[PDB]
C-alpha cells in the first residue's frame, strides 16, 4: 500500500485541466501526491489502495468529462 498509480488523460494539453485534477486528487482519502506528467501526456498519483481504491481515483477524473485511462503498477515498489 502507498504506491504509484500511472494514469493518462485524453486532454493533458488543456493546461488548467491537469491543475484541476491535481487539486481534486490531492484531497482524496488515500492520495498522498497528485499527478504530473503533462509534459509527455501522463499522470502519476501516489495512492493508497485500502480506503480509496484505484477505480474511484479514475472515476474522480472522469467526473470532469476527461477520458482517463489508468495503469496501476503494483501495491508497492
From Swiss-Prot:
Q: Which domain of life is it from?
A: Eukaryota
Subcellular location(s) of the protein: Golgi apparatus, trans-Golgi network membrane; Cell membrane; Melanosome membrane; Early endosome membrane
Query: Which residues bind Cu(+) 5 per the record?
Result: 14, 17
How is expression of this protein distributed across tissues? Answer: Widely expressed including in heart, brain, lung, muscle, kidney, pancreas, and to a lesser extent placenta. Expressed in fibroblasts, aortic smooth muscle cells, aortic endothelial cells and umbilical vein endothelial cells (at protein level).
Q: What sequence ranges are listed for the domain HMA?
A: 3-69
The domain section of the record reads: The nucleotide-binding domain consists of a twisted six-stranded antiparallel beta-sheet flanked by two pairs of alpha-helices, forming a hydrophobic pocket that interacts with the adenine ring of ATP.
Role of this protein:
ATP-driven copper (Cu(+)) ion pump that plays an important role in intracellular copper ion homeostasis. Within a catalytic cycle, acquires Cu(+) ion from donor protein on the cytoplasmic side of the membrane and delivers it to acceptor protein on the lumenal side. The transfer of Cu(+) ion across the membrane is coupled to ATP hydrolysis and is associated with a transient phosphorylation that shifts the pump conformation from inward-facing to outward-facing state.
Noted disease: Menkes disease: An X-linked recessive disorder of copper metabolism characterized by generalized copper deficiency. MNKD results in progressive neurodegeneration and connective-tissue disturbances: focal cerebral and cerebellar degeneration, early growth retardation, peculiar hair, hypopigmentation, cutis laxa, vascular complications and death in early childhood. The clinical features result from the dysfunction of several copper-dependent enzymes. A mild form of the disease has been described, in which cerebellar ataxia and moderate developmental delay predominate. Occipital horn syndrome: An X-linked recessive disorder of copper metabolism. Common features are unusual facial appearance, skeletal abnormalities, chronic diarrhea and genitourinary defects. The skeletal abnormalities include occipital horns, short, broad clavicles, deformed radii, ulnae and humeri, narrowing of the rib cage, undercalcified long bones with thin cortical walls and coxa valga.
Family indicated by similarity: Belongs to the cation transport ATPase (P-type) (TC 3.A.3) family. Type IB subfamily.
Subunit-structure text: Monomer. Interacts with PDZD11. Interacts with ATOX1 and COMMD1. Interacts with TYRP1. Directly interacts with SOD3; this interaction is copper-dependent and is required for SOD3 activity.
Name this polypeptide is given: Copper-transporting ATPase 1
Amino acid at each position: 500500500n502507498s504506491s504509484k498509480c500511472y494514469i493518462q488523460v485524453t486532454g493533458m494539453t488543456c493546461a488548467s485541466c491537469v491543475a484541476n485534477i491535481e487539486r481534486n486528487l490531492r484531497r482524496e482519502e488515500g492520495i498522498y501526491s497528485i499527478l504530473v506528467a503533462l509534459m509527455a501526456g501522463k499522470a502519476e498519483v501516489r495512492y493508497n489502495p485500502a480506503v480509496i481504491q484505484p477505480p474511484m481515483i479514475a472515476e474522480f477524473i472522469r467526473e470532469l468529462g476527461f477520458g482517463a485511462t489508468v495503469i496501476e503498477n503494483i501495491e508497492g515498489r
